[PDB]
Design a protein around this ligand. Structure first.
Ligand code: NA
Length: 419
C-alpha cells in the first residue's frame, strides 16, 4: 500500500480560545461523504468576534469528479462557551437529511435538521435557509435531554440514524440512544443503554456493520481523568435495544458499569489511559480499539483486537518515529479500507505536532505498523471520512492546525491510496 497523491484544502480559520472546539476526538462525525458529495462542519468566528462562533457546513462534489468547497453559515445560533467538550457532530440519514447536534457540556440538547433531503435531492444553492431552527428535543421521542454531553450519530443500514449521548456528568452518568426513522421523520427513544454506578462509561464511538452495532468503553470514577479503569466491549443485533458481551451472553438492559462480564482488559486507574479515543469495526467484522497507557514503563498507543476466533489481543503501536502519548495529549482514530485487509492508524504525535498515518495488515496480524504519510502542523484529534475511504480508496482527514490565531487553519487532507 502506497500513497498516489496528497492534496489539502484550507476550509476556515480556527476560532480563538483556551480550548479546542474544532477537531475533537468524539466528533461523530465531522466529515461525511453521502452519494456524490462530501460534507464537513466546524465553528468559525461570528462578527461579534472573540467568544462568538457560528456553525458552518461545507459541501463539495467528490464523484465522479472533485469540485470546490462551498459553505453556509448558521448565523442564528451563537456558540459562546469556551469549553473543549462543546463540539459538533453531524449525521446524514437515508432520506438525505443532514442532522447537527452541538455545543454541550452538561446542558440540554441542541439539535437541528435540514428542511428537506438536501444530500439526496441536491440543491443548487448552499445557504443557511436549508436548515430548520435549533430545537431542544427529538420530535417523536422523549427526554431526558439534559444534562447532555457527547452527541454521536451512527447511520443504520435502512437509512435510519442513531443519536447517542451521556445524560449526567463526569463520574456519575448514564448513556441513551434515540433512533430517527428516515421513512417517517420521527425519532424514537431506545432508552438508557448503559447505566453508571457513581461513575460513567466513556464509549469510544459507535460502529455499525451488517446489522450489528459495536461499542467499547472505559469507566471513569470521578472528574479526574486519572480515574479511568478497564476496557469494555458489547454489541447489539437490534440497533441498540439489547446487548451482548464478547461471548454472546445477553446483558441486562441497561448495561451496568458494575457488570464485569463486559470487561475485555483489565487496566487500573492511574494507567494514563484516556477516555473516548478510537474504535473500528473492520469490513471483515474484526473489532479494534485504540487506547494508550504507561503500563510498559513508556507511554504508548495500544491496539486491542477482537479476533475471529473470539480471543482478544493487546499490542503496542510502536512504529519507528512515533512518540507515545500521555493522558492529556490528542486522541487518535482507526480507519479501514473496503477489503478489511488494511488498518490505518491516524495518530497525533505530541512531540512532532503532526498527525501520522500508519498502516498495518490483517495478514501480519496487524503487527507490521509502517509509516505511510503525515499531516504536518496539527494540534488536533484527527477525524476521517469512512464512506469516502470505502467507496473511492481516498483517506480524507479533517484537522485543526497547530499555531496561533489567526494563522491556525482548519483543513481537509486527502490521501489517494494505491490499493
Ligand atoms: Na463518581
Amino acid at each position: 500500500l502506497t500513497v498516489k497523491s496528497t492534496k489539502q484544502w484550507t476550509i476556515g480559520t480556527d476560532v480563538q480560545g483556551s480550548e479546542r472546539l474544532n477537531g475533537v476526538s468524539y466528533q461523530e462525525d465531522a466529515l461525511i461523504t453521502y452519494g456524490d458529495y462530501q460534507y464537513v462542519t466546524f465553528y468559525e468566528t461570528a462578527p461579534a468576534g472573540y467568544l462568538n462562533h457560528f456553525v458552518k457546513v461545507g459541501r463539495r462534489r467528490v464523484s465522479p469528479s472533485v469540485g470546490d468547497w462551498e459553505f453556509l453559515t448558521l448565523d442564528d445560533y451563537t456558540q459562546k462557551t469556551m469549553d473543549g467538550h462543546n463540539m459538533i457532530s453531524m449525521g446524514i440519514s437515508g432520506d438525505g437529511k443532514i442532522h447537527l447536534s452541538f455545543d454541550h457540556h452538561d446542558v440540554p440538547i441542541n439539535y437541528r435538521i435540514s428542511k428537506n433531503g438536501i444530500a439526496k435531492d441536491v440543491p443548487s444553492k448552499w445557504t443557511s435557509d436549508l436548515f430548520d431552527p435549533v430545537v431542544h428535543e427529538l420530535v417523536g421521542s422523549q427526554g431526558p435531554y439534559s444534562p447532555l454531553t457527547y452527541p454521536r450519530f451512527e447511520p443504520l443500514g435502512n437509512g435510519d440514524l442513531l443519536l447517542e449521548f451521556r445524560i449526567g456528568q463526569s463520574g456519575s452518568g448514564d448513556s441513551y440512544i434515540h433512533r430517527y426513522s428516515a421513512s417517517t421523520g420521527k425519532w424514537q427513544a431506545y432508552g438508557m443503554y448503559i447505566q453508571g454506578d457513581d461513575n460513567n462509561a466513556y464509549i469510544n464511538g459507535l460502529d455499525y456493520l451488517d446489522g450489528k452495532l459495536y461499542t467499547s468503553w472505559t469507566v471513569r470514577e470521578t472528574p479526574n481523568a486519572d480515574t479511568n479503569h478497564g476496557v469494555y466491549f458489547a454489541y447489539s443485533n437490534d440497533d441498540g435495544k439489547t446487548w451482548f458481551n464478547t461471548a454472546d451472553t445477553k446483558l441486562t438492559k441497561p448495561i451496568s458499569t458494575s457488570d464485569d462480564s463486559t470487561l475485555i482488559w483489565d487496566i487500573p486507574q492511574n494507567s494514563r489511559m484516556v477516555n473516548q479515543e478510537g474504535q473500528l469495526i473492520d469490513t471483515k467484522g474484526r473489532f479494534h480499539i485504540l487506547m494508550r497507557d504507561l503500563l510498559s514503563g513508556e507511554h504508548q498507543y495500544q491496539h486491542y483486537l477482537r479476533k475471529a476466533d473470539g480471543t482478544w489481543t493487546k499490542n503496542a503501536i510502536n512504529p519507528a518515529g512515533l512518540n507515545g502519548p500521555d493522558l492529556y495529549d490528542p486522541r487518535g482514530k482507526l480507519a479501514g479500507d473496503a477489503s478489511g485487509e488494511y488498518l490505518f492508524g491516524i495518530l497525533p504525535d505530541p512531540v512532532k505536532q503532526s498527525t501520522g498515518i500508519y498502516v498495518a495488515t490483517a495478514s501480519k496480524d496487524f503487527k507490521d505498523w509502517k509509516s505511510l504519510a503525515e499531516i504536518p502542523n496539527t494540534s488536533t484529534e484527527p477525524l476521517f471520512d469512512k464512506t469516502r475511504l470505502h467507496e473511492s480508496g481516498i483517506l480524507s482527514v479533517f484537522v485543526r492546525q497547530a499555531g496561533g490565531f489567526p494563522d491556525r487553519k482548519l483543513q481537509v487532507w486527502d490521501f489517494e491510496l494505491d490499493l
